[PDB]
Amino acid sequence: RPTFYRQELNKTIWEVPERYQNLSPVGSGAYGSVCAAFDTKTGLRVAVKKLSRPFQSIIHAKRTYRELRLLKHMKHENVIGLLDVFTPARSLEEFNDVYLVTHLMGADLNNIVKCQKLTDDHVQFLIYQILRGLKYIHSADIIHRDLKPSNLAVNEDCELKILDFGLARHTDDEMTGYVATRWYRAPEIMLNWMHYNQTVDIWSVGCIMAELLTGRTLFPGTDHIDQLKLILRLVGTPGAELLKKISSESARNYIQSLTQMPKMNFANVFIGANPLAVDLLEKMLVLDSDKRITAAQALAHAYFAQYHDPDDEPVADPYDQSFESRDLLIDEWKSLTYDEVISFVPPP
């Protein structure tokens, strides 16, 4: 057992192993708060997330367990992994806090797009890496669902990892109005049209890739409906096949009220872009999610010829998420989480 020390940081007491020094607050929300630190054991700059009252309700306890499971499984160069997980508790009886440790990220992709010269080469490399990461997570049936430039971290070498920095509770208020939390979302998620699949994240990749090519948000809607109109303007209104797959009858009935529009010419929206980038965008930004290119198919697209190596694009180990349908009490979620904390083995 390491020795732990205590310190107050803004609003709470952080109790962490001695290896972790120079803790400095970097973010806070209702689900957790994060400090940057130096891990003296590995020489790494690390982020330390202390979950906020992780076992306060069934919803919080299950979300704690879910995030811990996910981070324990994800072992890929383009996906955030878990460097450490700890608790000051010496037994299940006293277990109440959970701290998760990852590499400390620097710039995100907003910090890249808002103020650099992005060549086509940069765009190929950055999108290649997102798709490489997504082939991996999707091979485990892990769906991100909130892929957006602020969740992609990028180093000075343009190396990228997919994360989720979200520290707040999931919410309606959050996706309301002229907000980046909605601009990248697939329209079937945005309007709850149907059970969504892993290509919700490929739609987001199309939106991010468009934005690296033009420097502008592709669909900066002022609300859900305005955004839906921007979308349909570009990709055209749904045809009969897609309409049937809209299980929501009110939603299906709303889209039929709209004047039909044809899919636009993407070379005339993405003026000057590499024709192969334009081709790829046409395959990503398809309204019917059954017809969208997958991450694995996209990595094989000619746009990525300079980067694609089918022997160096790995898939994940099988990921059991049967717990998602398990009906458990707070203390059972808490014990499952405890076992995962104590069984953690650090990466090499």
Ligand SMILES: Cc1ccc(NC(=O)c2ccnc(N3CCOCC3)c2)cc1NC(=O)c1ccc(NCC[C@@H]2CCCN2C)nc1
């Ligand atoms: C410590 C920690 C603990 C857990 C997590 N969780 C996740 O990333 C996470 C949670 C749920 N799902 C995840 N998955 C979903 C499937 O696709 C892969 C990602 C990922 C993430 C962190 N890391 C951070 O939150 C973090 C915070 C700040 C930071 N650097 C500070 C500077 C910021 C970073 C980018 C822009 N900068 C201003 N680095 C890491």
